[PDB]
Amino acid sequence: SIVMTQTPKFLLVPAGDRVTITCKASQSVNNDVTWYQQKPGQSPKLLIYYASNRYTGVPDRFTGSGYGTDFTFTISTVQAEDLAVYFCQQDYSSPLTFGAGTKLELK
Amino acid sequence: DELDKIDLSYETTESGDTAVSEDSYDKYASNNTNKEYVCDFTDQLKPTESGPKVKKCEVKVNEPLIKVKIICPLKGSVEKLYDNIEYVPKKSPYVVLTKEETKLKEKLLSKLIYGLLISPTVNEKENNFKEGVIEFTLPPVVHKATVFYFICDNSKTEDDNKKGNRGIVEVYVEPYGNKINGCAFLDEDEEEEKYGNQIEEDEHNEKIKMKTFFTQNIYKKNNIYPCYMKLYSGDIGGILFPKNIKSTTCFEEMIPYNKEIKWNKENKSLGNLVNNSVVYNKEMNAKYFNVQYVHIPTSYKDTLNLFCSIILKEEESNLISTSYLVYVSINEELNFSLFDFYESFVPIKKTIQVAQKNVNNKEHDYTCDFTDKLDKTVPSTANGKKLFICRKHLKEFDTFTLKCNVNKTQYPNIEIFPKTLKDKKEVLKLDLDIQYQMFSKFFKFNTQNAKYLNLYPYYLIFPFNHIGKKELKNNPTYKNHKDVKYFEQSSVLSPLSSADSLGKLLNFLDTQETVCLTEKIRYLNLSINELGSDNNTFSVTFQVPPYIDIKEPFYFMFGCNNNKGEGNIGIVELLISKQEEKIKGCNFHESKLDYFNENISSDTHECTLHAYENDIIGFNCLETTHPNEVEVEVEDAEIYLQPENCFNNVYKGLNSVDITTILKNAQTYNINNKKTPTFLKIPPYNLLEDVEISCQCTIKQVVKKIKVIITKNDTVLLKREVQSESTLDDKIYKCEHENFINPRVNKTFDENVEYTCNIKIENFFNYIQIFCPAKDLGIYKNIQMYYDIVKPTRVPQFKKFNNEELHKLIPNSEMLHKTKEMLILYNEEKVDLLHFYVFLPIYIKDIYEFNIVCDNSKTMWKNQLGGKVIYHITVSKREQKVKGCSFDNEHAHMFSYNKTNVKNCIIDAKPKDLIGFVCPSGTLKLTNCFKDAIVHTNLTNINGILYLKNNLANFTYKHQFNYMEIPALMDNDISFKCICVDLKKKKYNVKSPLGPKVLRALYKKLNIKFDNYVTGTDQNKYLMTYMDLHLSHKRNYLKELFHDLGKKKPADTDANPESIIESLSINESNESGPFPTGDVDAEHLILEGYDTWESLYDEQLEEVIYNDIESLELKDIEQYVLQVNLK
Amino acid sequence: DIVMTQSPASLALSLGERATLYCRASHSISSWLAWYQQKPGKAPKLLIYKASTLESGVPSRFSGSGSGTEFTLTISSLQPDDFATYYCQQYKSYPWTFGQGTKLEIKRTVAAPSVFIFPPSDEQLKSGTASVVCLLNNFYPREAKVQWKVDNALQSGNSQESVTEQDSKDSTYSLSSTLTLSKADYEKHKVYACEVTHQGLSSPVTKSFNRG
Amino acid sequence: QVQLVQSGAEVKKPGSSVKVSCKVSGGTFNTYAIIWVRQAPGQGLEWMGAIIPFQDRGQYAQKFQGRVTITADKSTSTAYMELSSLRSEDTAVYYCAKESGRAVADRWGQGTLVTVSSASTKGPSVFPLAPSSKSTSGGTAALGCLVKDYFPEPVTVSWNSGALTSGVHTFPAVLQSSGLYSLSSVVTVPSSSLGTQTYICNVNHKPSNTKVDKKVEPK
Predict the structure, then answer these.
(1) Which sign, positive or negative, has the C-alpha torsion B889, B893, B895, B898?
(2) Residues of chain D by 3-state class (helix, strand, coil), percent to 5
(3) What number of other Cβ atoms are within 10 A of residue B848's Cβ?
(4) Which helix (H) or strand (E) holds B640?
(5) To probe the interface with D, which of B13, B27, B56, B102 has the most D CB atoms within 10 Å?
(6) Which chain D positions have a beta carbon within 8 Å of C95's beta carbon?
(7) H/E element holding B603?
(8) Cβ contact (<8 Å) for D103 and B170?
(9) How many Å apart are CA B589 and CA B807, to the nearest integer?
(10) What's B34's DSSP letter?
(11) Which residue of B has its CA nearest to A28?
(12) Which of B15, B99, B147, B169 to substitute to test the interface with D, most D CBs within 10 Å?
């Protein structure tokens, strides 16, 4: 099956600074990639679908880019409430595979 | 008459005077009970409160041969509840109300819908609303939708506060059906239309409608062929009788053929002959359409042949009537069997049946059950044992099931043949060599068209079966066949009885070669159940693969034998033929598939396809065993296929959905022993939307995905033009896909595919290969050859293509046929008659642009349709005046010397020169002069002397125009002559090259000796020889047989046509026996191999010429000689 | 084609009065004529679908008549919802046609105009174009004549007019006249005036200002 | 029950093509004809063509050939029209109708508006028509606003967000030689209220998505 590799596993960024999370695939997936964000004690929330489009109601500070094999998730200005763990997901061929996840921390 | 008196516009609306609009119309259809749309207006138009409410009867017709009945109560039917009723239109079994603009106008239903079956009498009463009941029957095929109305108004009916309603009938007809399987006796002579339809500027008249409705059309004059009507279970046929008909016995007073069991009964009725069959328009009553229709019930499974006759008015002079005999066939599948062409199996009494549609109501399921046919008959039956045979021609995705009882309580010790069928899944393979030779002589069949067998006309079995029987007996070619003991003659001292025939039949089954069904045809799903759940029945079931990868059709039997239990014997006859060569599938594996349209490279991971009705989609992700690979028993690789089944349940994204939810009752094919590939045949569906379905496979940890686009546009693509460039293969212009002229499956997008070939000529040795055979019965019935000119003059008129027409376009050019001769001493030559090659001279005057078109697409069938190929030819300018002499004034333009009436011509030639030779018009060519040249009054082969090899001299020695190139090096000065012999008495039309018999006689008279001649040693080569354009010496045996049969008038009045047909026999003297005369080395094998061997020398004219030469003397012989000096 | 010579062009009436419409034809035609009602901003609604019959829901005061070369539609009395523009259509032949249409004016009472003038604003002066608007507020009848004078010199061709629909509240409908000139010419001239002539005015009313 | 629905108004450049969508809901679709009529504002209506859906062969007016096209699609119960090679004077309202079996068109659609002027999208310029500022007063004053240089129609004008609707007249737009529309909106208010009341005019031009609020005060 198609396997996501998501780096860096632990990412540290000061409040109000831009942060980027990378994702790499094993084969061409065109544009079927999605990004999820999860708080502790809360269910994951979808932010980016089609790997470059914000979902309805997502704040403008969340953006995504990439095509084919390398995909990136970027936050323009991290907030104090953005402490969460981010996952990537491919939606090209079943079974759908989730990324290892990346944790974002404030200094 | 009252049938047609349309002279009133009668502008009226649907609601009439009522204010009710169409929103509140009481719309309810006519009742449906045993194929009868009836909406009787009884009690629905009576005066009542809450009205007038418009009542509308909607008759929607989408089935053939439909009966429509309408009833309106008369005045005074019930006391004071029907007074003042009005009927619109007054003439409404025939005249109908139609809708133009926003009004309702009267029109003739016959004009709107052709073939309407008006019944002037209904229940012994008149057919009109004046009786109150109207009746008519619709035809079985309708070209375009038609809507018409009837009105039964009761608005003027009232009773104090009550008022009547208004009745409307709306009949809605949709197109259905293609054509009627029958005859169309026309009032016009035979005519051939041009390849283009642009000459259809005339209006849409009625005459054109008539010719496009029946599969066969017979003209009033110059007819050569009697009609042959073939029907099928659940099919419809019909006959259009001539306007001058006097009598007809083609219905009711009909005649069976089978003499083996007939009791000399005179006439029998189709209703009695075929149970549950119904005949339409028995009395032949209609305004204009003198037609009758017949429907054969689906449950019918018997085979039966019938004759009938048609008699015309006015006869010929006083009482000589030129009546027609037309043949009726109801069920004959795979009839070309060895149980008819072998006389030893004639005595056994059999019952020939076809495989009916299965009870499960699946359209492509065929079943034969012999449970009630293998019973131990009563001993009082003096006839003896019986043979029950099923015949059936299978196609792609067809499922055949054999059902057989093996219960020991009823049928002890029953034997299943083959004895290896239960264990090794083997069946009795048979050879089809006899059929090929028989078809070649009669139908001009070629062995390369084996895959299209059983499509040729069924004339060889009926009515002309005796001809086939005599052919095997008389011709020595079948004397050494391994089955000659079976089709040999019997004798009074060694007769064959019913028991004797059974013994030979058992021997015949035991000696035929046995081949496993699965190994013979791959991707075939076969399931054998030794004993069913009922513990009584043995069943064999299989489904035809989606693609038949066999060079020739597979022809076999199997079944059950109950001889030991004194029972009957069951036999099933099956044939398999290829339908289409390409499958639109995606192959993601390294090993390519020749029958897969799209092979995807390893670098590409996705594949997209467009699907449409009747199309086959494939999907392969595993290995395939080519003949270059050694087959071994290896387990299938762990292919990760999602879903587990690919095409019965398909991915529409992330969720799995069954294919039947997307496609209306789809047919899917898988392999039991192989995980992949999987196939789907697209059924007729109403889901016009562009829907996406997909499968996926994991090959070497890499996911491969296939995408299929299912589409059905509101309008099919008008045309699909594919252009290809000609390729040079050993100095011959050849075009790929030239075999597209052959029939193809009637797929939705393949109906209007046209192939164009581009040919450019800028060098000599210009041979244009054109595969365009002469029109013949069966696969090439409607082949026409036409051409048009583009440059320098754009000719607006299409013209037929022939040798004379080609000569006018390009002077001194020829059409030539390929010859593969091995030794000139033979009386017959190896010729490929399917291809004819165009040869043009060096002197191409200017740029000539023209197209050569054959339009075999006019040949259409139920499942396959013919091809169409266009040859676009362009020629480059040349100005080479070949050296030669113009003996006649007609040859002046070709040569630079005005040698008119110059009998002795001398040319001094040097290397790097070209010399051409022509004889004067209609004069005998003495020698080739390039392969056999006269040197010092001695015939010598200058090819060896001049060391010529594959030059112009060797390739053009047998043409009307012979050219030669002088070799670069020569040993010494050499002089040779070329002579034409002209006889002063008469002018001879030399249509074929002169044979050695005539040539030797000329040599003796002209004092020419040949004693040191040496033949060539060329091998695996080719030569062009001229023979007209289509051979008229290959006599059509069938045409002569029918012509002689027509002279005898087989059916005038109780003429017993069976005896007349049997007495009809072709004289064997018309044929020269086996063409391979003499001793044949047979070592010259290449490519196609042993092609047709026909004689080229026209014996009749040669005999006249041979006699003339002996009688004539020197004074009456004139010589035209070309002398060539080489230094 | 069949011509629809519908007459008259307009009708001025009050509540309770009688209105009689007419629609003639080029040649004699047996029935097959329909009348369509349409207020400004409405779809043409069918009221009479034959020679004299009426559609469901059409009020009873409508009554059609006539045949041949002449047809007549008579309305016995007008109600507040009966004023619109009416058309007549023939369909005896496929090429249908419609008439010029008839107008139903509310009330008949002459009222003089209220004339107002407006000088261009400084914001528009910066754009290089100056516009002067004259307002004729609540007149009756509609045939009011407006002329523009600049420094007592007549200005024509450089002005446009627009008229509102008649309102039943007080038989009111205004007309807007606008004068367009470049900013450079607005400075060269000082006196700008507009003259209004109307039936209800004994003498023309002039509004003017001195700005430039 | 039967109702007709048509597409929205559209603006096209000269030489282009415009398509009008028509749908028939209720009743039945196949066996009744659907007709088309257009009308230039201020003039009589013009008939164009009709079609019966069960037959794709439609017929048009003798004067209009080629440019007008009418087609029917029974699968979606629609009667789309395609008009090609547009030219000036084509700016008119287009109407659709069908016959209810009484030989006359009984139901008509909501209609469509077509514009063909060579101009393009542009936003209006709003200027104030301030009331005559003088000491005369007397409870009789008129004030308004000027809408100029916009294209195409429509533009909506409201006063005080839909307040004091008595005496406010919105004038129909006029076409200038430059190809841009223009109109004025006025309202009559008491003169003594100028110093104690504020009047605001709201202008909304949907084609250009331009919304402007302009205050009117004495100069």
Answers:
(1) positive
(2) 0, 45, 50
(3) 20
(4) strand B640-642
(5) B102
(6) 47, 61-62
(7) none
(8) no
(9) 54
(10) S
(11) B605
(12) B99
Whether the Cβ atoms of residue B389 and residue B572 lie closer than 8 Å to each other: yes
Q: Which three-class secondary structure state does DSSP give residue B517?
A: helix
Rg, Å, chain A Cα set? 13
Among B22, B291, B319, CA closest to B149: B22
Residues 80-119 of B with CB under 8 A from C: 101-102
- Strand residue runs (E) in A1-107: 5-7, 10-12, 19-24, 33-38, 45-49, 53-54, 62-67, 70-75, 85-90, 102-105
| Residues, chain A | 107
Widest Cα–Cα separation across chain B: 128
The tokens for B434 are: 């006899």
Q: Do B101 and C91 touch (CB under 8 A)?
A: yes
Q: Does an interface of 3+ CB pairs under 8 Å exist between B and A?
A: yes
Residue D66, min C-alpha distance to chain B (Å): 20
Of B605, B642, B651, the CB nearest to A28: B605
Whether residue C53 and residue B19 make contact (CB cut-off 8 A), yes or no, is yes
- φ and ψ of D124, to 5 deg: -75, 160
Q: Which two tokens stand for residue B967?
A: 């070799």
Q: Report yes or no: A31 at the B interface, CB cutoff 8 Å.
A: no
B279, amino acid identity: V
According to DSSP, residue B774 is labeled P
Chain C 27-46, CB below 8 Å of chain D: which residues? 32, 34, 43-46
Maximum C-alpha span of chain C: 68
The alpha carbon of residue D204 is apart from the nearest alpha carbon of chain C, in Å, by 19
Method used to solve the structure: cryo-EM
Partners of residue C91 in chain B, C-beta under 8 Å: 101-102
Q: How far is the C-alpha of B328 from the C-alpha of B458, rounded, in Å?
A: 12
Is A96 near chain B, with CB under 8 Å?
yes
Is residue C77 less than 8 Å (CB to CB) from chain D? no
Resolution (A): 3.6
Question: Subunits that touch chain A (at least 3 Cβ pairs < 8 angstroms)?
Answer: B
Q: Which two tokens stand for residue B1031?
A: 């051979």
Q: In whole angstroms, what is the distance from residue B274 CA to residue B259 CA?
A: 18
Bridge-based pairing state of the strands A19-24 and A5-7: antiparallel
Cα–Cα dist B973/C188, whole Å: 114
Residue D189 distance to chain C (closest CA, Å): 12
Distance from C-alpha of B533 to C-alpha of B574, rounded to nearest angstrom? 27
Q: How many residues does chain D have?
A: 219
Q: What distance, in Å, lies between the first and last C-alpha atoms of chain B?
A: 94
- Separation of alpha carbons C122 and C135, rounded Å: 20
Q: Which helix (H) or strand (E) holds B434?
A: helix B433-443
Residue B594 · residue B626 · CB < 8 Å: no
Assess contact for A87 and A36: CB atoms under 8 A: yes
B/D interface, count of CB pairs below 8 Å: 47
Count of CA atoms in the C-beta half-sphere (13 A) of A43: 2
Beta strand residue intervals within B1052-1114, DSSP E:
1093-1094
The pair of structure tokens assigned to B657 is 């959905």
B775/B781 Cα distance (integer angstroms): 5
Query: What is the identity of the amino acid at B961?
Result: F
The two structure tokens encoding residue B413: 């010790």
CB neighbours of residue B28 within 10 Å: 12
Phi, psi of D55 (to 5 degrees): -120, 125
Q: Say how many CA atoms lie within 13 Å of B311 toward its Cβ.
A: 13
Are the C-beta atoms of residues B372 and B576 closer than 8 Å to each other?
no
B22 with D100: Cβ contact below 8 A? yes
Decide: helix, strand or coil at residue B997: helix
> Which residues lie closer than 8 Å to C69 by C-beta, 6 or more apart?
C24, C25, C27, C28, C29
